[PDB]
Amino acid sequence: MHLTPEEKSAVTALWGKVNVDEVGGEALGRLLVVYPETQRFFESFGDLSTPDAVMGNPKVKAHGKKVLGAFSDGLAHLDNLKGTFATLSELHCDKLHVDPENFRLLGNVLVCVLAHHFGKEFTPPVQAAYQKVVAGVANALAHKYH
Amino acid sequence: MHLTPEEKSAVTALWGKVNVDEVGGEALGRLLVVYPETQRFFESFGDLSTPDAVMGNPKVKAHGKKVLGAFSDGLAHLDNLKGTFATLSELHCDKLHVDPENFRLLGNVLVCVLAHHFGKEFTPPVQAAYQKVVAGVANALAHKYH
Amino acid sequence: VLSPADKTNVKAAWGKVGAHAGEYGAEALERMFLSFPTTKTYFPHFDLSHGSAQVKGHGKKVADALTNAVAHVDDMPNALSALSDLHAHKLRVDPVNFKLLSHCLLVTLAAHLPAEFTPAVHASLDKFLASVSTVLTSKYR
Amino acid sequence: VLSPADKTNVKAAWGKVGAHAGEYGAEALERMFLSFPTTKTYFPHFDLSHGSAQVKGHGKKVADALTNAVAHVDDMPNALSALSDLHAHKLRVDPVNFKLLSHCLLVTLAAHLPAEFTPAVHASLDKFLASVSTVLTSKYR
Ligand code: HEM
Ligand code: HEM
Ligand code: HEM
Ligand code: HEM
Structure with missing residues (x-):
């Protein structure tokens, strides 16, 4: 992950402030509303006909937390994202x-979520480092596809 | 660039039958006819207003030869595409x-030219190995952008 | 937008394809599954072995729909309406994948139609597959 | 296609941007150049340093064309015809870039307009920027 020391530091510090329950739920919710096609994998979650339904759906919130939890753990393995997400890659495939x-779509939604919560603090340099991490995660999750 | 030995042999075998000068000209010319926006880089080449003007333009033919010659040299270094193309990457940026x-558009046009020249012999498995190779070359030429 | 010359080019090329469409559709699919493996995620219920019957069968359907689009080139959004709804509401295939099928169809045509696959025709065909893909993808959200 | 509530969502969100449009357009450009350096290839005549006047100036221009698109939401292809011609015949920007700029504009709005950037409005802004992009690349070939 061609991340710069000042970039690894930027990612880590911002993340120490994230409420993972809230952000995970919001990112997965926004994904399903902004890109409805993604609802195809979540038929069993219930009603997703409207934004209010999606955002309130407790299974959506819970799955968001799980997704973002795996993401968190990857942020501690930035030198070996592929190795960290291998099993998860196999299962997704x-x-x-x-x-x-x-994965790329979720990445970008996540980035919008971080800006929405952190405002001023989510500056251009901070975003750039996050775009590198999100593409990094996406690539590791896609790595074992065959 | 994960190439298997049988992929690498397939790629090399075929490339041995390629007249690089001619294929170089067909590929550059077709890029400029099928994706006319790419003409933004070649205004010094004169008349590119119709297909015959592009395909028979001696400057397109000469530049095509130069492009494909560099590409060939890369097929002789599949294990270090990034080093091989480093100076060209910086130049292009x-x-x-x-x-x-x-670079990705050219890669796909090249694959259509290879299929066109070789017909049957360009089987699905041979095409798959060439798709990995064109993506690898494109990634290596982009690696030094900043 | 397709131009008059484009339309002529597509009709001529597709006419030469003739009663091979089916066979060329299946081949474009096999090429796609092998070159771009992520595309298989949409066909977990299919047998994807060389010569598979589901592959042949699905090849014919794709090819028939392209034939129908060539037959109604001046009215494609309406001629393909049903397919557009299908792809938007049930299948929900990510648009990048359409570009990958289109490339593989082009590769398949180049391999079987050497005399017809001239630069001008390649250009018109690529534009035609792009219009078809835009229609199939127009009702996604 | 933009639905009624989409248009309503966009008019309102853009409404609140107001006199900050120019500042946001410049910010979105700066975010794009840093996050996606390949986009810089289209601006080799620009001073790209932080706070440069060319970026600021250009940021205003983009932001103003967007205001005009919102005001003309029902008739975009016509209100943007000259910009569409400009991008197709002169600038010739590869379409992938429009998605990078659109994402950076969203991130910018999400950062400046917390109360207004609801899930439904996010959805609508994304479809709007996507339509604007389609309009700007529709005469490419
Ligand atoms: C940030 C990238 C992502 C990560 C890190 C991630 C991670 C995870 C994890 C840890 C699980 C739990 C699997 C288990 O319990 O064994 C999971 C399940 C799942 N993920 Fe992903 N995910 C990501 C993106 C996506 C996206 C984009 C989709 C589709 C839109 C998706 C679809 C699913 C589905 C369908 C499941 C199974 C859910 C169920 O139990 O019904 N994931 N994911
Ligand atoms: C397979 C990928 C490519 C390779 C290996 C390649 C290689 C080369 C080489 C060896 C040169 C000559 C360098 C020099 O003048 O010192 C060159 C120049 C050039 N290339 Fe690339 N090229 C590739 C793709 C492209 C593409 C896709 C474009 C634009 C669409 C492009 C645009 C140019 C331009 C404008 C020049 C300078 C032409 C001139 O002398 O006026 N190249 N390339
Ligand atoms: C040139 C573009 C395409 C055309 C013309 C096309 C046409 C069709 C047709 C005719 C059907 C059959 C519907 C029926 O049975 O009535 C179909 C179904 C289907 N298509 Fe598309 N298709 C295109 C691209 C794609 C791509 C890019 C994907 C995803 C990789 C895709 C995935 C599917 C799937 C998964 C089905 C359902 C197959 C089944 O369950 O039997 N199609 N398409
Ligand atoms: C929402 C999408 C976009 C809109 C609304 C937009 C709008 C504009 C406007 C208003 C101008 C100024 C025209 C004039 O001088 O009157 C312009 C020029 C330009 N745009 Fe686009 N633009 C968009 C996306 C892009 C993107 C994605 C790129 C490539 C990264 C790009 C590259 C350029 C360039 C290089 C110029 C000329 C700059 C100069 O020489 O001053 N634009 N655009």
Whole structure:
């Protein structure tokens, strides 16, 4: 992960302030509302017909927390993202059949979520470092696809 | 660039039958006819107003030969595409200002030219190995952008 | 937008394809699954072995729909309406994938139609597959 | 296609941007150049340093064309015809870049307009920027 020391430092410090429950729930919710096609993997979660329904859906919130939790753990393995997400890559490919292009979408939604919460603090340099991490995670999750 | 030995043999085998001068000209010319926006980089080449003007333009033919010659040299270094193309990458970024997306368009046009020249012999497995190679070359030419 | 010359080019090329469409559709799919493996995620229920019957069968359907689009080139959004709804509401295939199928179809045509696959025709065909893809993807959100 | 509530969502959000449009357009440009350096290839004549007057100036221009698109939401292809011609025949920017700029504008709005950037408005801004982009690349070939 060609991350710069000043970039690793920027990512880590901002993340220490994140409420993962809230952000995970909001990112996964926004994904399903902004890109409705992604709802195809979540038919069993219930009603997702409207934004209010999606954002309130407790299974959406809970799945968001789980997703963002795995993401957190990856932020501690930035020198070996591929190694860290290997099993998860196999499962997304072999059991869940998720087109990896969806990982990139979630990444960008996440970035919008971070800016929405942190405002001023989510500056251009900070964003750039996050774009590198989100593409990094997406690539590691796609790595074991065959 | 994960190439298997049988992929690497497939790529090399075929490339041995390629007349680089001619294929170089067809590929550059077709890029400029099929994706006319790429003509923004070649205004010094004269008339590019119709397909015959592009395809028979001696400057397009000469530049195509130069492009594909560098590409061949890269097929002789599949294990270090990044080192091989480092100076060309810097050149394309700092002096020529070429958006790397263009390298991906050329890659796909080249694959159509290879299929066109070889017909049957360009089987699905051979094409798959060439898709990895064109992506690898495109990634290596973009690596020094900053 | 397709131009008059483009339309002529697509009709001529597709006419030469003739009663091979089916076979060329299946080949474009096989090429796509092998060159771009992420595309298989949309076909977990299919047998994807060389010569598979689901592959052949699906090849024919894709090819029939392209044939129908060539037959109604001046009215494609309406001629393909049903397919557009299908792709938007049920299948929900990410748009990048359409570009990958289109490339593989082009590769398949180049491999079987050497005399017809001239620069001008390649250009018109690429534009035609891009219009078809835009239609199929127009109702996504 | 933009639905009624989408247009309503966009008019209101852009409404609150107001006199800060120019500042936001410049910020979005700066975010794009830093996050996605390949976009800099299109601006080799610009001083790209932080706070440069060319970026500021250009930021205003973009922001103003966007205001005009919002005011003309029902008739975008016509209100933007000259910009569409400009991008297609002169600037010739590869379409992928429009998605990078659109994302950076969203991030900028999300950062400046917390109360207003709800899930539904985010959805609408994204479709709007996407339509503007389609309009700007529709005459490419
Ligand atoms: C940030 C990137 C992502 C990460 C780190 C991630 C991580 C995870 C994790 C840890 C699980 C739990 C698996 C288990 O319990 O064994 C999971 C499940 C799942 N993920 Fe991903 N995910 C990501 C993106 C996506 C996206 C974009 C999609 C589709 C839009 C998706 C679809 C699913 C599905 C369908 C499941 C199974 C849910 C269930 O139990 O019903 N994921 N993911
Ligand atoms: C396979 C990928 C490519 C390779 C290996 C390649 C290689 C080369 C080489 C060896 C040169 C000559 C360098 C010199 O003058 O010192 C060159 C120049 C150039 N390349 Fe690339 N090229 C590639 C793709 C492209 C693409 C896709 C574009 C634009 C669409 C492009 C635009 C140019 C331009 C404008 C020049 C300078 C032409 C002139 O002398 O006026 N190249 N390239
Ligand atoms: C040139 C573009 C395409 C055309 C013309 C096309 C046409 C069709 C047709 C005719 C069907 C059959 C619907 C029926 O049975 O009535 C279909 C279904 C389907 N398509 Fe598309 N398609 C295109 C691209 C794609 C791509 C890019 C994907 C994703 C990789 C895709 C995935 C599917 C899937 C998964 C089905 C359902 C297959 C089944 O369950 O039997 N298609 N398409
Ligand atoms: C929402 C999408 C965009 C809009 C609304 C937009 C709008 C504009 C406007 C208003 C101008 C000034 C025209 C004039 O001088 O009257 C312009 C020029 C320009 N735009 Fe686009 N633009 C967009 C996206 C892009 C992107 C994605 C790129 C490539 C990264 C780009 C590159 C340029 C360039 C290089 C110029 C000429 C700059 C100069 O020489 O001053 N634009 N655009």
